[PDB]
């Protein structure tokens, strides 16, 4: 069993992320996650808040995880990529998930609230059984 | 056992994927892919087809991928990146496999059908035993 | 048990490489890697030595890993990425380590030598238990391909 679970810190992102469960039974490896604020990304290196904290749990047990770029994160008209390549997160980490993006082009890149940029995937690639998006006013999981 | 299954779907791939199945005694993690048609990558984003639907499976069960750049990718005059970082394929996924590459240098350069720039590394990097390379006038399910 | 080995080829290296037996009671996924050596990258690619050569083992047997990029490798002030987004060690690879490394800026960029600008990952994402650093004089079989 491998599960993921999810909790908007912010208001913005509540918006995006109800409490609920969600099942993964296209069995993709990578869960989406979203801006949840629109963003003016400048050239060159900007940080950039998701808005959730995040845990991922197999066999019981809390695990690591991964966020990769989604295929669609960077377009003809936005050379975006993360800066270090793929996001390890370990097991013990409870802060707020955040992005190291590179804007590689010369101009600003506009991104919206709704889009997806990124994917978590489970430490080890286990498909995701359960995708639980916590209440904002709930205790994390310790 | 995990084992990758290749089938090219062009007449171009066709002869880079003779029908054979390979085995991988030397234990490298990766299954290296040919560009199989000679390419010019403009500067910043190119789609790169690379004229293969694959599949992977572990201990008999269709699962997921991911697509990895090789060492050889970027050179000096060549200074080549994936887009995504690495490619994640999901199990479901049966299309063509395609690259972004980004040419993050200031002229276009030649990329011959012959070289492999990317390798496969099956879900949680279980090393590979076969690679089984299929025919290409063949439904398989 | 996931256990990786690291043994410093240089001088330099084995100052900041001393043997010992590291647990890993965080039970972080990856294993921090140094410089040990000031370096001045200039734009573009460069190739970098790490000065060890790595083994991994899972349940006993050697097996590959990976080197990922710390956070701390790309900052406002020096735009750095690894080449090839990571790095894909086969347990049948027995040299020592390099990496890929593109400064993105029109600046050369300096790299002192404490900084860990990367880190390894067992394959299969495995948590290490031990990080066992070896002698720099000695010759040790399990390097062997
Ligand atoms: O893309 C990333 C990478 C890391 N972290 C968090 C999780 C890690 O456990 C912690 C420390 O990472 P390093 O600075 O050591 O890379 O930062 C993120 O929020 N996003
Ligand atoms: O480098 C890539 C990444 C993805 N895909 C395919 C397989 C995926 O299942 C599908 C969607 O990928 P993402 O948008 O989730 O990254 O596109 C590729 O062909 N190449
Ligand atoms: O970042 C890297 C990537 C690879 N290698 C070594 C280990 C690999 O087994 C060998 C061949 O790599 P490829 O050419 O297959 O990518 O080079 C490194 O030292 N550093």
Redesign the pocket.
């Known amino acids: 069993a491998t599960n993921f679970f999810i909790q908007p810190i912010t208001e913005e992102a509540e918006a995006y992320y109800p409490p609920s469960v969600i099942t993964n039974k296209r069995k993709d490896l990578?869960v989406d996650v979203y801006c949840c604020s629109d963003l003016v990304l400048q050239p060159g290196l900007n940080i950039v808040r998701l808005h959730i904290k995040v845990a991922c749990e197999h066999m019981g047990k809390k695990c690591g995880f991964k966020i990769m770029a989604?295929?669609?994160m960077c377009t003809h008209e936005r050379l975006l990529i993360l800066a270090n390549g793929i996001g390890l997160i370990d097991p013990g980490y409870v802060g707020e998930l955040m992005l190291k993006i590179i804007n590689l082009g010369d101009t600003p890149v506009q991104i919206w609230a709704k889009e997806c940029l990124v994917?978590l995937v489970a430490q080890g690639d286990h498909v995701p059984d359960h995708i639980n998006i916590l209440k904002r006013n709930q205790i994390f999981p310790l």
């Open positions: 990578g989604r295929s669609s994917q």
